[PDB]
Amino acid sequence: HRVVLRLPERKEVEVKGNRPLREVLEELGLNPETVVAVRGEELLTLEDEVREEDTLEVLSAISGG
Amino acid sequence: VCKVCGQKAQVEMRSRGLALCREHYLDWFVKETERAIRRHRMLLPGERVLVAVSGGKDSLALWDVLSRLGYQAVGLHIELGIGEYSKRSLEVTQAFARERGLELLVVDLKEAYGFGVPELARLSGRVACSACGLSKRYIINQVAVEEGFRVVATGHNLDDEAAVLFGNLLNPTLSRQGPVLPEKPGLAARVKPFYRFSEREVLSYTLLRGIRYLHEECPNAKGAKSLLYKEALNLVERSMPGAKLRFLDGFLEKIRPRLDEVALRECERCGYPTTGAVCAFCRMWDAVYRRAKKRKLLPEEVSFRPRVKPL
Ligand SMILES: Nc1ncnc2c1ncn2[C@@H]1O[C@H](COP(=O)(O)OP(=O)(O)OP(=O)(O)O)[C@@H](O)[C@H]1O
Ligand code: SF4
Ligand SMILES: [Zn+2]
Ligand SMILES: [Zn+2]
Numbered sequence: 001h002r003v004v005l006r007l008p009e010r011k012e013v014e015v016k017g018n019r020p021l022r023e024v025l026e027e028l029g030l031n032p033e034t035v036v037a038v039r040g041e042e043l044l045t046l047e048d049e050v051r052e053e054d055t056l057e058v059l060s061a062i063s064g065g
Numbered sequence: 066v067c068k069v070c071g072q073k074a075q076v077e078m079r080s081r082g083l084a085l086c087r088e089h090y091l092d093w094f095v096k097e098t099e100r101a102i103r104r105h106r107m108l109l110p111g112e113r114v115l116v117a118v119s120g121g122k123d124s125l126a127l128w129d130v131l132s133r134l135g136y137q138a139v140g141l142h143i144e145l146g147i148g149e150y151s152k153r154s155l156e157v158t159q160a161f162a163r164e165r166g167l168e169l170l171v172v173d174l175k176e177a178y179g180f181g182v183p184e185l186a187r188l189s190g191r192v193a194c195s196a197c198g199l200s201k202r203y204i205i206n207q208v209a210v211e212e213g214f215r216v217v218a219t220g221h222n223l224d225d226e227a228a229v230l231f232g233n234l235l236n237p238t239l240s241r242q243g244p245v246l247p248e249k250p251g252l253a254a255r256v257k258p259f260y261r262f263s264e265r266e267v268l269s270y271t272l273l274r275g276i277r278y279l280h281e282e283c284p285n286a287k288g289a290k291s292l293l294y295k296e297a298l299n300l301v302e303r304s305m306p307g308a309k310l311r312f313l314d315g316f317l318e319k320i321r322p323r324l325d326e327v328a329l330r331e332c333e334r335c336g337y338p339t340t341g342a343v344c345a346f347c348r349m350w351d352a353v354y355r356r357a358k359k360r361k362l363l364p365e366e367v368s369f370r371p372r373v374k375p376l
Contacts (some may be wrong), residue, residue: 007280033299036268045077047086059272061264062258062295063121064226064286 001052003028006059024050025045025058034062066188080306087273094267094270098258105245107256108216109295115214115253118169122271122280123220124166127259127304129276131218132167135240136340138218141208143201144173146181147193150283172204172210179363180353182285188353203346207337209253210374216254224264226257227309228294242323243317251328251338251374261310261353263302303341307363335372347371358370 003024005011009063016053021037021044037044037058067074067086074084085093104109108131110166114130118140120125123277132139132358139325142158145151155171162169185196209217226242233239248254259267286292331337332344339345350369357363 001196007161007282009281031296031303032298033263033265033302034295036265036272038272043075043087043272047075047077059268059280061224061268062292063222063225063264064282064289 001050002055004057006057009015016038017050018056019050020046021048022046028058030058035060069085072313076266077273078266080263080302080310084208090182090269091273094262095130095133096264099134099259099260101244101252101258102256105146105256106154107218107245107258108136111137113139113214114255115205115209115212115217116140116218117201117219118142118161119220120154121220122268122276122278123222123259123264125161125220125276125278126157126267126271126274127220128161128167129165130270130273131258132165138167139212140167140215141205142169142171143199144171144175145200146173146175146180147183147197147283150279150281151181153279153281157277166243170208171327172201172208174204178369180348180357184362185349185353187283188356188360189349190352190356191349194289197285199345199349203337206251207372208252210251210337211372214250214253215295217256218256220247220259220267221257222262222264222267222314223260223309224295224298225291226260227298227313228291230292230313231298232290240321243321249338251331251336252329260313281339294301295318331374334373335371 001014001017002015003015005013015027025032031045035058038059039054067082067089068073068083069089072086076086076090077084096168107175110112114131114136116128116138117127128138128140140158140162144155144302159169180195182197185191186193189196205217229242244257246255280299298309329338330340332347333337334343334347337344354363358365
């Protein structure tokens with residue numbers, strides 16, 4: 001529901017839940033290869049379900065070099 | 066699910082046809098690094114290795130893995146003098162070393178030579194990244210030779226290496242690129258144990274390990290061509306798992322050996338390897354000091370004194 005974006009460079013948006021992570025990433029236009037989504041201490045995969053009460057942190061895997 | 070234990074996967078890799086839970090991803094990552102090292106003979110068992118550490122996810126993960134693998138891994142951090150980014154990079158790296166009881170060597174660019182990367186982007190005649198790259202490579206090699214390290218390890222990953230290759234093809238050098246570069250006189254060996262790992266995979270390791278790394282990118286990185294290359298390659302990877310690795314492996318094994326003979330000189334100033342009379346590092350500082358004096362940022366009677374290569 002609440003999605004914290006990286007890098008900070010802080011950015012925070014919000015989306016609807018009860019759908020796979022694959023779906024919410026596509027809405028945000030994020031390439032799954034380039035990010036890691038974290039709920040608490042647990043990493044989420046594309047098939048994993050995000051809730052309507054969930055708080056996610058999406059971290060960029062991409063190094064600017 | 067996890068391929069090993071059948072429980073819920075923390076990391077799914079479609080490129081490898083492999084999914085793993087936390088415990089078994091951690092083991093696999095360490096073992097794949099060990100396998101990468103053995104295959105290309107990057108390091109000797111228990112050997113002293115200089116790890117170039119930025120505080121970023123890759124180089125901290127590398128320092129972690131090389132320590133776990135029994136190598137004697139000393140970190141080198143270079144404080145590049147880029148604003149708060151460099152300050153935080155140092156702090157994060159010191160914190161990592163402190164917690165794990167690891168030896169960290171530090172070179173402060175501004176403190177040693179008078180000017181950091183931002184000043185170099187004005188005074189050197191080079192753009193920031195150009196001056197920075199040169200400073201990093203030279204100083205890393207210098208510390209290695211001075212402290213008697215045979216080999217240096219950097220945290221370059223698959224996306225990094227694939228991007229460089231793609232860049233080199235888009236703007237034709239090629240033959241110089243490799244995961245293992247041989248030691249020479251005045252030149253430590255250079256190895257990239259993470260070169261087959263995607264950024265996503267290294268980051269997953271770093272997160273699952275609970276490693277505190279600097280999230281912030283350097284401010285000079287935005288709009289870099291490397292980001293464009295990675296974006297294009299990852300566009301392909303998304304719909305064609307394994308493409309990046311086939312791309313880089315294909316080049317290394319097939320194309321590169323058929324691409325290519327002058328001996329490296331010795332710098333008149335510092336004595337370190339160069340193809341010129343005076344190496345690029347020493348020429349940069351001579352130009353910087355000249356320009357600095359004109360702008361009254363440096364005293365006229367101050368002179369650049371290089372640390373000469375020992376023998
Ligand atoms: N300030 C620094 N001091 C020492 N080594 C560095 C420094 N910056 C980069 N390196 C070395 O060069 C490699 C490539 O750096 P690059 O700028 O591509 O990524 P990075 O910002 O260092 O993040 P990461 O540590 O995740 O690679 C790093 O993995 C590290 O080994
Ligand atoms: S981007 Fe990478 S290279 Fe360009 S300046 Fe910042 S750190 Fe040095
Ligand atoms: Zn498992
Ligand atoms: Zn020199």
